[PDB]
Every structure is written in C-alpha cells, then in structure tokens.
C-alpha cells in the first residue's frame, strides 16, 4: 500500500539526457510531459 505509492512516485521514466548542440543540430529535441 505505502510501498505501492512509493513505487508509483519513484518509477517514472525519465527521458534520455539531451546531447550537446552540434552544428548543425544532429538530434531533434522535444518538450517532455513530466508527471504532476
């Protein structure tokens, strides 16, 4: 129960880290919908 809530809060999938800005831009970024 409490453990269920803990795991719900802590197991959210983070996006990969943004890469540095190559010239020209190599990877297309995007806004991420972080949970709230």
């Amino acid at each position: 129960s409490c453990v269920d809530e803990i795991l719900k809060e802590m197991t959210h999938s983070w996006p990969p880290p943004l890469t540095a800005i190559h010239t020209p831009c190599k990877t297309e970024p995007s806004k991420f919908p972080f949970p709230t």
Binding site: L7, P24, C25
Partner: protein
Amino acid sequence: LPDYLIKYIAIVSYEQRQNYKDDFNAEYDEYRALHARMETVARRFIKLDAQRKRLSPGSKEYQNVHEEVLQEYQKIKQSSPNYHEEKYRCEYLHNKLAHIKRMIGEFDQQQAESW
C-alpha cells in the same frame, strides 16, 4: 508559463544562435549531473518494482523487496538537499535546454532551406 519560453524566441541571426548555444552550455554541466542522479535514484526503485511484480507474494523474497523499498525511500526522504527540489530543478533544466536546442534546430533547418 516558464520564463525561458518568453526569453528564447525564434532565432534571426547566427550571432543569436551562438548566444543561445553558449547559454545552453552554461547550464549543461549541472543539468547532466542532476539528470544522472535522477536516473540512478529511479533505477533502484524500478528494479525493486519489477522484482516485486515477478515474485510470489507468499515468498520471503517478496517481504525483503518490500523492506528494501521502505529503506531506500527513507534514504531519499532524508537526503539533502530535498529530493523534490532536485527533481524540479532537473525537469526545469531539461525542458529549458530542450527548448533552447529546439530554437537552434529550427533555425538550422530554416537556413538549410535557403542555399
């Protein structure tokens, strides 16, 4: 409405691209450190969650996973600075830097459409 959406608008010149890139780089180190911590913290709980899902609820292993979740969460609750402040900082930096990079990428696309 996040401030970086008001500040970092569409790029009209290469000097602006340079300034945007420099601003991105100025916070990239903090961003990567925080992001790495967030992934490392999440990993333990994702692992424990998967274990809990594949275990028999009548097994001692199940009780051990339960206990380990409680202990690790206790570690997080007592950490300094507060975990939630770090998480908020990391989300803000991620979407800010993503936005700046988006402005730079859309500019690059536009420039490539005209030469």
